[PDB]
Ligand binder design. Structure first.
Ligand SMILES: Nc1ncnc2c1ncn2[C@@H]1O[C@H](COP(=O)(O)OP(=O)(O)O)[C@@H](O)[C@H]1O
Ligand SMILES: Nc1ncnc2c1ncn2[C@@H]1O[C@H](COP(=O)(O)OP(=O)(O)O)[C@@H](O)[C@H]1O
Ligand SMILES: Nc1ncnc2c1ncn2[C@@H]1O[C@H](COP(=O)(O)OP(=O)(O)O)[C@@H](O)[C@H]1O
Ligand SMILES: [Mg+2]
Ligand SMILES: [Mg+2]
Ligand SMILES: [Mg+2]
Lengths: 96, 7, 372, 414, 394, 7
């Protein structure tokens, strides 16, 4: 598949190796950073990713109207909207 | 439930 | 200015909102997820139990447990968590400043209402509360005063006939057969194809397959021959890991358990006979109005073909000269909440609350006298 | 006030020492100990009794390889401590000489491989609690800390808490799937084939072919040949042919110094450029018990996790440890995994009937800026949080229950 | 043999073992592992005198596993490899086994419950097109177990090598809504034992070493009784360490593992299976039945399958059921527990109950023509002949 | 199996 390189050498001292090697173009002694800020930022970003992964996934709360919306296409040919209203029953036994 | 059915 | 909270808390889905709106503010599955692994990345948001939507987005590594089975709260520590998440995280409002209108199924044990009231008055410290029958709010929302409500939630299916506002409690019928049983029956019939779903986190995938693909056949003994002759009825579904399933015959055999509960090993009659018997329990005079005002509600009645089959059944069952009209609006997935918001906003209702003073005088045993 | 907790990641070929709260280990020494050993007769538990104060005449780390009159012993083999006398002496100089920590004022966070026997944890607890008297200990699995070391090199908004960590160190290679922050322990895989097996294979190759390598350095050379001229090949027989037909380009020269007379020896590095790392995708080259490539092991690991967490696990395969710093290692791993996944997806589509074409599973192998010490930094995170002091085993817990307090880890139930 | 000279064979075709014989027999004529092996070379084994064919099947493929790569044609009761299964069946009806002319014989096959229908359809197709049997029937396993025991009511807990299933039957009427099927059995217990042994430094990674670990689990392992007491024994004393000699010659030591590998039936969460153990699953199956049948289901708990032969499994099952009943029926009344009457019927030859039930049923129905699926019905209808059994397929 | 579990 992918071609290889014959003339690649990452000569490094054992002491240079313990920190990183020239096979990864960034490895080695990195700039010291704040760890708690990184931790909280990763937590918040994972929370935001979970929120959008939920929003873009299948939603059970989709047919209750409002922001969720109404599951239309579920009305039928013999279905009559609640907007409709019949009249009270009047049988001949009820007049005179 | 307690008797009949679970719940 | 204080406005009541309408909080449904039925089995399967909890829907909360403010009194006087046209749609629930927050809808989320009523589950509680316990983590079933021991994670050591401490400080990254670890918890002991995830409630509502937060459980679904993590259901892969959780055991999901429903605190309400068949309308009965089998775990009250979990129900307190559900209510706390509803109050402080979904609605974001203190409970001690608004009255709370909860709903319940008919023919539930009295301990359910007793503990509902005790919790709403001793833990959340609400100033007033109420407990309403769901099938009555499902008629409030429909803009009626006479009709038979056929409410089929996730865990329980009950029918209540009302005429001119006077309910007939001697004809209220209940049937412990709903979405949760249809979802556990689909989990069984899916094995005939080779698909094996067993984990509580795959019951949700099966519930999604059921609420996206399944339909109710108008004629079961004919649709069986149809699905047997040709492959023009199959549908494919894509699991959240890549695998694809296909279901042709299960589509209408899943909701057919509603009309033939013998499929699940139950003696009881189907939902059409449950409604018909509940109609014929009333008086001879009001049966005509109950026939032509048959309301539907609840998620389990959101099946394409449910109204046609229900009419075909209750028409072959009713006298030949009675007109049947299955009132089934597309907003019936939340009719009970709309009825609750209508009832809580009325002025003549502001005397029907159970005040904190009343509860302090007679304890939790009061909810039986006030609440119908 | 509180002092920072000490982090001591003790690996088979290298130990990383530091104080929690920093960005990189303060020390990275070899995990070796130089003690005076002579020609004696009798058991090992009997010739180790040193009279007087002669049991403190030993060195560790870099200062133990220089000593030519001492005998150098490695206490840890395959990540599992096989010698506890040497390990106790190593720990006591780690604490009192390098870290300069008073072991009664600092919580300790040690590490372990997945399949460390419970008796090893009990002995470690006995050592740290009764001999050094630490106020608290926490023995975390090694690869699970390596996940929280890839966040410093990836763009904002894509630092996930879910991924499959592949830790290949000096003595052991283990695969740990983490999902949403919870270690899926019942799916962890553990293979004792790692860097040192590659170094033994390479020296056996060099010794069968080359001449002029001093015996006392035949290992030290096979490390400089392995960590310098080694790469990964897309195909084995094709690479043998490429070396046979055009040897003038693919065959390199290595020039080392004989550290007795300071002369220089020269050897030819040939096939062991690509045969070294190939024991990762052909473990039978070094241990005839295992026969399963690393791509297939990773695929089994991910295919055993829950269903709805399989697709994110494929997206964040994080490499860690030194033995994964081979050129185009992640590339070949991802290629094999993509082959397997696409074949499985096409089979599922064909079995479905041919109506839906599902989303192709994104497979990614993440190389980052911290791989050589990715474990330790992870610890330096966990041991810098407040909640850390709530998951440690306090000294009271040991004084009450005993060493059996440290007997459980997330690889086995109950 | 019937009144037509057509032999009536009974073949169990288990995931971990084939048990075949004739109708009316009291013992399986042949019990041999169901695995197919192919010859390979290994750098650690050297054999140069035993003739190894290009395809070994069954018993010889297990005794000669050191020089073969073996694979099972079945898994979880579902045939994964159809060519290997056809080879296993060729060997079963071959000369060095049951020696029958399949053109003039009837056969009685089995199948676990809640199994994909294409599996049974393809098995019947193979039996009618390849071997051209004159009659085939596919009975239910729990029905056969109750035939062998001699009952009409009981809750069969059949735990084979490949799969565990709990099937209650009352007065001869099958309740198919209570059939539970847990996917933990001998093979998952063997894999868990392999994991535990790997924690000790032994590596069983080959296809042949699986049978070695199986033979270890069968000799040494046992199900605990009071798991707290067993853990106290394993952690405080040293009376559970037992040595086993592998075929090559190595001597391994097995200690607490003896009661941790077979515990994954009662505590599935050890092997990453989210559910309930076999005892809790049995109790839920019973308590899902009508009130009038529970009291009789408790008195006829019929064990079956090889994986229920662990030393002390009946007693541990009974203790678990009594504890569940005390906590969840009597709600904690110890006085009433002495009135609770269980009876876990564990016959001595419970490792071949399904075959004995098949033998009884075939001895009963050999001479009928409305019981067997005849080859003519297959040539006329196809895979629709299965509708004779009560399983409706088109 | 075909979907779910291997068999
Ligand atoms: N569109 C739909 N089609 C089929 N079944 C549905 C649909 N919507 C909901 N259901 C079933 O009904 C249940 C949801 O009903 P819901 O009204 O949420 O119950 P509750 O009001 O008691 O929470 C689910 O368990 C689901 O199985
Ligand atoms: N750049 C590199 N390329 C190849 N192998 C390496 C490299 N760096 C280190 N190694 C090998 O990895 C091992 C040391 O890595 P390390 O992660 O410290 O293992 P451990 O932590 O178990 O000691 C040594 O065997 C060494 O030969
Ligand atoms: N005495 C025993 N103790 C524990 N396990 C056993 C014993 N005998 C057999 N087994 C396990 O159960 C399997 C045999 O059971 P069996 O009922 O023959 O399986 P099948 O379902 O293939 O018929 C073997 O593969 C073995 O792993
Ligand atoms: Mg409802
Ligand atoms: Mg390491
Ligand atoms: Mg069997």
């Amino acid at each position: 598949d992918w071609e290889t390189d014959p003339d690649f050498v990452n000569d490094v001292s054992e002491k240079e190796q313990r920190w990183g090697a020239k096979t990864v173009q960034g490895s080695g002694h990195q700039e010291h950073i704040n760890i708690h800020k990184l931790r909280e930022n990763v937590f918040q970003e994972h929370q935001t990713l979970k929120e959008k992964e939920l929003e873009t996934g299948p939603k059970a709360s989709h047919g209750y109207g409002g922001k969720f919306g109404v599951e239309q296409d579920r009305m039928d040919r013999s279905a009559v909207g609640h907007e409709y209203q019949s009249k009270l029953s009047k049988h001949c036994s009820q007049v005179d | 439930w307690x008797a009949x059915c679970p719940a | 200015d204080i406005a009541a909270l309408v909080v449904d808390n039925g089995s399967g889905m909890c829907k909360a909102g403010f009194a006087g709106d046209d749609a629930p503010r927050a809808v989320f599955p009523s589950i509680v997820g316990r983590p079933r692994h021991q994670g050591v990345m401490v400080g990254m948001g670890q918890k002991d139990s995830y409630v509502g939507d937060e459980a679904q987005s993590k259901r892969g590594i959780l055991t999901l447990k429903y605190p309400i089975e068949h309308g009965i709260v089998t775990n009250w520590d979990d129900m307190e968590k559900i209510w706390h998440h509803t109050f402080y995280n979904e609605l974001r409002v203190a409970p001690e400043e608004h009255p709370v209108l909860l709903t319940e199924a008919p023919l539930n044990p009295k301990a359910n209402r007793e503990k509902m009231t005790q919790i709403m008055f001793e833990t959340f410290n609400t100033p007033a509360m109420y407990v309403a029958i769901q099938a009555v709010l499902s008629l409030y929302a429909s803009g009626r005063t006479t009709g038979i409500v056929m409410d089929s939630g996730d865990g329980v299916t009950h029918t209540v006939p009302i005429y001119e506002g006077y309910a007939l409690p001697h004809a209220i019928l209940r049937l412990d057969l709903a979405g949760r049983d249809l979802t556990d029956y689909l989990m069984k019939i899916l094995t005939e194809r080779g698909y094996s779903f067993t984990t509580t986190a795959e019951r949700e995938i099966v519930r999604d397959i059921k609420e996206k693909l399944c339909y109710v056949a108008l004629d079961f003994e004919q649709e069986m021959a149809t699905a047997a002759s040709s492959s023009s009825l199959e549908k494919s579904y894509e699991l959240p890991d890549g695998q694809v399933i296909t279901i042709g015959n299960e589509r209408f055999r899943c909701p057919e358990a509603l009309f033939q509960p013998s499929f699940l090993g139950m003696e009881s009659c189907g939902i059409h006979e449950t409604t018909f018997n509940s109609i014929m329990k009333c008086d001879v005079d009001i049966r005509k109005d109950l026939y032509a005002n048959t309301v539907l509600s609840g998620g389990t009645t959101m099946y394409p073909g449910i109204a046609d089959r229900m009419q075909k059944e209750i028409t072959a069952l009713a006298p030949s000269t009675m007109k049947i009209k299955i009132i089934a609006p597309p907003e019936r997935k939340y009719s009970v909440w709309i009825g609750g918001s209508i009832l809580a906003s009325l002025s003549t209702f502001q005397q029907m609350w159970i005040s904190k003073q009343e509860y302090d005088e007679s304890g939790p045993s009061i909810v039986h006298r006030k609440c119908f | 006030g509180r002092l920072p907790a000490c982090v001591v990641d003790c690996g088979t070929g290298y130990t990383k020492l530091g104080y929690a709260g920093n960005t990189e280990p303060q020390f990275i020494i070899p995990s070796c100990i130089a003690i005076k050993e002579s020609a004696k007769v009798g058991d090992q538990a009997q010739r180790r009794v040193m009279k007087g104060v002669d049991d403190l005449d030993f060195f560790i780390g870099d200062e133990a390889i220089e000593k030519p009159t001492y005998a150098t012993k490695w206490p840890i083999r395959h990540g599992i401590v096989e010698d506890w006398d040497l390990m106790e002496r190593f720990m006591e100089q780690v604490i009192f000489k390098y870290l300069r920590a008073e072991p009664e004022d600092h919580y300790f966070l040690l590490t372990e491989p997945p399949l460390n026997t419970p008796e090893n944890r009990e002995y470690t607890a006995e050592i740290m609690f009764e001999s050094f008297n630490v106020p608290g200990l926490y023995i975390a699995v090694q690869a699970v800390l390596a996940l929280a070391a890839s966040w410093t090199s990836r763009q904002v908004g894509e630092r996930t808490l879910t991924g499959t960590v592949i830790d290949s160190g000096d003595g052991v290679t283990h695969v740990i799937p983490v999902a949403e922050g919870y270690v899926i322990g019942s799916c962890i895989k553990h293979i004792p084939i790692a860097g040192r097996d590659i170094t033994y294979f390479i020296q056996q190759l060099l010794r069968d072919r080359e001449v002029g390598i001093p015996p006392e350095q035949s290992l030290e050379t096979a490390k400089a040949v392995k960590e310098r001229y080694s790469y990964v090949c897309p195909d084995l027989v094709k690479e043998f042919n490429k070396y046979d037909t055009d040897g003038s380009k693919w065959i390199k020269q290595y020039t080392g110094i004989n550290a007795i007379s300071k002369k220089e020896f020269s050897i030819d590095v040939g096939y062991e450029r690509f045969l070294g790392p190939e024991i990762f995708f052909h473990p039978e080259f070094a241990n005839p018990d295992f026969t399963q490539p690393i791509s297939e092991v990773v695929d089994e690991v991910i295919q055993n996790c829950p269903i709805d967490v399989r697709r994110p696990l494929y997206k964040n395969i994080v490499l860690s440890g030194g033995s994964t710093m081979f050129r185009d290692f992640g590339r070949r791993l991802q290629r094999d995994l993509k082959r397997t996944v696409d074949a499985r997806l096409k089979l599922s589509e064909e079995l479905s009937g041919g109506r839906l074409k599902p989303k192709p599973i994104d497979v990614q192998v993440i190389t980052h800026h911290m791989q050589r010490y990715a474990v330790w930094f992870g610890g330096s995170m966990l041991a810098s949080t407040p909640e850390f002091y709530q998951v440690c085993h306090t000294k009271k817990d040991y004084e009450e229950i005993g060493p059996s307090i440290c007997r459980h880890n997330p690889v086995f139930g109950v | 043999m019937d009144s037509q000279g057509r032999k009536v064979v009974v073949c169990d075709n288990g995931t971990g073992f084939v048990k075949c014989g004739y109708a009316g027999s009291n013992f399986p004529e042949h019990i041999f592992p169901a695995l197919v092996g192919r010859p390979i070379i290994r750098s650690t084994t050297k054999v140069g005198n035993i003739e190894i064919k290009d395809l070994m099947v069954g018993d010889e493929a297990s005794e000669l596993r050191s020089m073969l790569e073996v694979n099972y044609p079945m898994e979880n009761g579902i045939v994964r490899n159809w060519d290997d299964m056809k080879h296993l069946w060729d060997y079963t009806f071959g000369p060095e086994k049951l020696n029958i002319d399949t053109r003039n014989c009837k056969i009685l096959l089995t199948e676990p419950p809640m199994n994909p229908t294409k599996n049974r359809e393809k098995i019947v197709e193979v039996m009618f097109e390849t071997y051209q049997f004159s009659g085939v029937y596919v009975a239910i396993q729990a029905v056969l177990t109750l035939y062998a025991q001699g009952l009409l009511t009981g809750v069969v807990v059949d735990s084979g090598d490949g799969v565990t299933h709990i099937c209650p039957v009352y007065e001869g009427f099958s309740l198919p809504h209570l059939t539970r099927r847990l996917d933990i059995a001998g093979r998952d217990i063997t894999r868990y034992l392999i994991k535990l042994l790997l924690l000790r430094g032994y590596a069983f990674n080959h296809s042949a070493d699986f049978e070695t670990v199986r033979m270890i689990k069968e000799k040494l392992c046992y199900v605990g009784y009071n798991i707290e007491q067993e853990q106290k024994l394993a952690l405080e004393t040293t009376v559970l360490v037992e040595s086993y000699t592998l075929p090559d010659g190595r001597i391994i030591k097995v200690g607490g593992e003896r009661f941790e590998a077979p515990e994954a039936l009662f505590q599935p969460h050890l092997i990453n299976v989210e559910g309930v153990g076999v005892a809790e699953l049995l109790f839920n199956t019973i308590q899902a039945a009508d009130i009038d049948t529970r009291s009789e289901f408790y008195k006829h708990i019929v064990l079956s399958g090889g994986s229920t032969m662990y030393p002390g499994l009946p007693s541990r099952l009974e203790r678990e059921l009594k504890q569940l009943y005390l906590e969840r029926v009597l709600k904690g009344d110890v006085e009433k527990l002495s009135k609770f009457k269980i009876r876990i019927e564990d016959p001595p030859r419970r490792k071949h109950m399904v075959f004995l039930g098949g033998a009884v049923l075939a001895d009963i129905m050999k001479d009928k023509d409305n019981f067997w699926m005849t080859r003519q019905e297959y040539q006329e209808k196809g895979v629709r002949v299965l509708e004779k059994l009560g399983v409706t397929v088109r």
